[PDB]
């Protein structure tokens, strides 16, 4: 949610060498809170192709905190958008509000 120190989600430095060489791939990364304690909740990622129209696609099996998310198969819009949502492990009841992520231009092809 939104306590003292709020969570943040951004993309990764991709474009030039992106470390290795993939056939068009992106890289994300985010972190909720976790004050050095246990707790194994769960989180999902969201990414839609920002263009004339869009249907928004989702992702699951995501770790509360990712070190270098790796997505691939993005080709349809000129710019892509990405947000983030979270919840507990198996307690479906609120899912909190969709936190705002960011928008940028991924691989060119």
Could you explain the architecture of this structure?
The protein is mostly beta strands and 109 residues long. The chain has one domain: Immunoglobulin-like (Sandwich), CATH 2.60.40. The protein is 0% helix and 44% strand. A four-stranded antiparallel sheet has the order 4-3-6-7, with no helix packed on it. Strands 1-2-5 form a three-stranded antiparallel sheet, with no helix packed on it.
Radius of gyration (CA) equals 15 Å
Element-by-element helix/strand order: EEEEEEE
Which CATH architecture is right?
Answer: Sandwich
CATH class: Mainly Beta
Question: What's the count of strands?
Answer: 7
End-to-end separation in angstroms reads 36 Å
What spatial form do the alpha-carbon principal axes imply?
Answer: globular
Number of domains: 1
Q: Output the strand order for the largest sheet.
A: 4-3-6-7
Q: What is the tally of helical segments?
A: 0
CATH superfamily heading: Immunoglobulins
Largest sheet: 4 strands, antiparallel
Q: Write down the CATH topology.
A: Immunoglobulin-like
């Amino acid at each position: 949610g939104s306590s003292l120190e709020p969570p943040m989600l951004q993309a990764l430095d991709i474009g030039p060498d992106v470390v290795s060489h993939q056939p068009g791939c992106l890289w994300l990364s985010w972190k909720p809170w976790k004050p050095s304690e246990y707790m194994e909740q769960e989180c999902e990622l969201r990414y839609q192709p920002q263009l004339k129209g869009a249907n928004w696609t989702l992702v699951f099996h995501l770790p509360s905190s990712k070190d270098q998310f790796e997505l691939c198969g993005l080709h349809q819009a000129p710019v892509y958008t990405l947000q983030m949502r979270c919840i507990r492990s198996s307690l479906p009841g609120f899912w909190s509000p969709w936190s705002p992520g960011l928008q940028l231009r991924p691989t060119m092809k």
